Amino acid sequence: SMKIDVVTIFPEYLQPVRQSLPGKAIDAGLVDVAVHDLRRWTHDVHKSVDDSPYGGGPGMVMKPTVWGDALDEICTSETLLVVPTPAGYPFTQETAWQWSTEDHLVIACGRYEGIDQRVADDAATRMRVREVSIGDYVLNGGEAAALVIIEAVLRLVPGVSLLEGPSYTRPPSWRGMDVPPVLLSGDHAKIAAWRAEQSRQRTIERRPDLLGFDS
């Protein structure tokens, strides 16, 4: 069974991990997900986790000291440390398959302008570290990305290309819109071929990159 530890300053926000696909995985005993408040490893009265960036710039950077202490306690040499960041390597379906075989994922959720780079650099001297992005958009922090990664990985664990075209179910006519007749015909070869043509049309239109075309 897999162990996933999530470290965040917003532990309550990782509640969606519950009943859902990850929730079912947890209750089936296929994974254990534990969420940790980063502030647990602070020592000052104000529980500060961030400070202004060296060299200037807007916002705050998360302090290495607190993160270092947290990861010391939670990680081992076998840990795969996942660091969600807009500046990361792309997280893809291939990545999800790869991580689905891991014994222990630790996900370090950052906020503000991110985590002092020395945290990942230091961790990499003792364990495998993967800084990853889940897409080309900006988030306030890594927490929502952690949920996406957990969803993409867990649905692949034992025990749990091109675009899929349109799908239909009953009734065969609805608001004057009919299900494509071929889908009702029971002709496997014809259905297979129609579904391939639909997938091609959709992939060209929506994701031409998947077929090696521009945009």
Added chain:
Amino acid sequence: SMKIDVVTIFPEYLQPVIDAGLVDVAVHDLRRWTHDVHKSVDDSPYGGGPGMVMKPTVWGDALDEICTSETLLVVPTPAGYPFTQETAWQWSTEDHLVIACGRYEGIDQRVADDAATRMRVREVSIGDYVLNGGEAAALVIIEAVLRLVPGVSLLEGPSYTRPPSWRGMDVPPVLLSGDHAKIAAWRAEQSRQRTIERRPDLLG
């Protein structure tokens, strides 16, 4: 002022949303619009194959109640157009977003096609991986859009803060130099190197 309605069979997933003003996020249990005592939301796919397809009659009723002509209907799906920061900026000025969360096998296509005859519909993916359902994607979309609502190229390089020395690693001395033109040039080179290494697709 933006209103976001999310429709899902997992309302608790999305439930915990700041609470600062002109932004209302309401979550709706899709089972509210089911017709049968079993509260069925999906059915076997026409043409065969694995999985289930979400029912058009249920989704049709839900969207009829929740949507208006002004609504931007967002449908998270792995088969979508890509959701990008450009998309986020566009949607941030919308008065009403409705996010229809379904299982990845899909909502019967007639739902989106019907809706598109009376409102703007956007089927979108948030990346190149499959999720079992659109719920986590909706969280990402809501976050990416709302942080662009006032008061609601190249990769960035490494950042640093106190202490100047930690576990044998010093903050790059240039950042402490007070030469701010040089600091900008150093950061640009860091960005170049990181983009080449991690995201060469961004350079062409």
